[PDB]
Every structure is written in structure tokens, then in C-alpha cells.
């Protein structure tokens, strides 16, 4: 399905689904963001966690 | 206080570059690759002619299974980037129908817009700069060629969207 997720500077980015660093690994450079200086999220997940798991509910990431 | 917000949105074809553009424009590099965009928003903050602006863009899906929801990107927007390849001319007859739903969701003939032919890097462009210009005489709006590789009038084609904005 889709998953969408906010950015920092009021940006924001949906990617599809798997390792939940490896689905937004494009996104994130594409975006200008290391996947090691940030992290998910007003919860933060591992960044190991499977992308499929919340899948229909938004998060946010920071750094 | 002295700055001022414009949403840009940025429509198009599947593959004519609205991701490319945006990349070469925000951090001043060519992606080579290709990696469909579902749904991106960016922010820059840039000084076009005296002002201090900041611009928040929207990068859109043209593929129409994931466009469906294209009524809402639309209905926030207040500039729009159409986008169609110089080597695709699918994508240039393409431009009548996003314009429709543009001027449908706003409900107006004057919306600031800019026609953009892209890949203008390539040779054997199958549409010439003369159908395009006459297309946007036609919709009363300004038309420039960019390259988002060489970023060849990148710079001048979203400046001349924002100043469409401001001069409404
Ligand atoms: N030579 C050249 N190739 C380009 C140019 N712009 C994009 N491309 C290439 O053509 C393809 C277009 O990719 P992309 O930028 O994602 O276009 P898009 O319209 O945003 N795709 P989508 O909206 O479906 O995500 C890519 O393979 C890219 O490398 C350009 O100005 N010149
Ligand atoms: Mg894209």
C-alpha cells in the first residue's frame, strides 16, 4: 500500500513497502537526510523495524 | 515577517523529469537514475529579484493510479509547474488535460502557470519550441526550456512560476 511520513523545514515524503530503512533509504537521500543521523517516530521504532507494520498510520522523523 | 510563502506544484507525464528538475533545483545535482515519485514536498528559501522568499514544492505522481488523489494537490496550490519532455510528445498533448483539471479545481482562466519543455540536452526533440510557444499564447502563460542535467534555465523557469504568482 502507502505510508506517508513528515520532514523537517515543513517537508514530508510517501513511499510504498521490509526493512524500514531499506524502504526509505531513496527517499531520504533524495530528500538530503543520513539514515544514521535520524530516526522514525510521537514514538520513535528501530530503524530495522518491517515498513509493512505500520502501514496506513503516518509518522514524523527528525534527526 | 518580510517573507513571503508560495506552494508551488509541479505536474506532468510519468517520465519527463518533474523529480529531476526539482533535485537539480533544491541541492544542485542530476539524479542519472529514475525512481518514481510518489509524493514529495520540499521547502527553499531563495532571494528572487528583492524579497526574500520561501517556496514549498510539490512533486506529484503522473501516473493516474496513484493521480486519482490529484484533487487535492491541486486544491492547495497557488503556482503550477506543467512539465512535458521535448521527446515525448504524448507528454506535450498531455498538457491540455492537466490545465482542464487545474482550471476546474480552481475555478479560473488566469492561474499562475508556466509551460516547461524539459531534456532540452537532447537532439531529435520530436516537439519544437514553436508548437509550445503557441500553446501557451494560447493559455496566456509564459514558456521556457530547461534541462534538468545541463540545469539550463532551471533556475529561470521556477523564478519566472513565483513571479507569475507575485505579479497576480
Ligand atoms: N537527458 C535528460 N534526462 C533527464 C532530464 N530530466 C530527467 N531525465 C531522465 O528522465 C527520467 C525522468 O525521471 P524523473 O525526474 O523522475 O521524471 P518524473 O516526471 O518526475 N517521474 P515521476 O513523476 O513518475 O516520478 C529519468 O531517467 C531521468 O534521469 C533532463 O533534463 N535531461
Ligand atoms: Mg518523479
Known sequence: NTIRVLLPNQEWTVVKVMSLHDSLMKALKRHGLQPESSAVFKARLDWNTDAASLIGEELQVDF | ?168
Open chain 2, 1 to 168: 515577517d518580510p517573507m513571503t510563502e508560495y506552494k508551488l506544484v509541479v505536474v506532468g507525464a510519468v517520465g519527463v523529469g518533474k523529480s529531476a528538475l526539482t533535485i537539480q533545483l533544491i541541492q544542485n545535482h542530476f539524479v542519472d537514475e529514475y525512481d518514481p515519485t510518489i509524493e514529495d514536498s520540499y521547502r527553499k528559501q531563495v532571494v528572487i529579484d528583492g524579497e526574500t522568499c520561501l517556496l514549498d514544492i510539490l512533486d506529484t505522481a503522473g501516473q493516474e493510479e496513484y493521480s486519482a488523489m490529484r484533487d487535492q494537490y491541486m486544491r492547495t496550490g497557488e503556482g503550477f509547474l506543467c512539465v512535458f519532455a521535448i521527446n515525448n510528445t504524448k507528454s506535450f498533448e498531455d498538457i491540455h488535460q492537466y490545465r482542464e483539471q487545474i482550471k476546474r479545481v480552481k475555478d479560473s482562466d488566469d492561474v499562475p502557470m508556466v509551460l516547461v519543455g524539459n531534456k532540452c540536452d537532447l537532439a531529435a526533440r520530436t516537439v519544437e519550441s514553436r508548437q509550445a510557444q503557441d500553446l501557451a499564447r494560447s493559455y496566456g502563460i509564459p514558456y521556457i526550456e530547461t534541462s534538468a542535467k545541463t540545469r539550463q534555465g532551471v533556475e529561470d523557469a521556477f523564478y519566472t512560476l513565483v513571479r507569475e504568482i507575485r505579479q497576480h
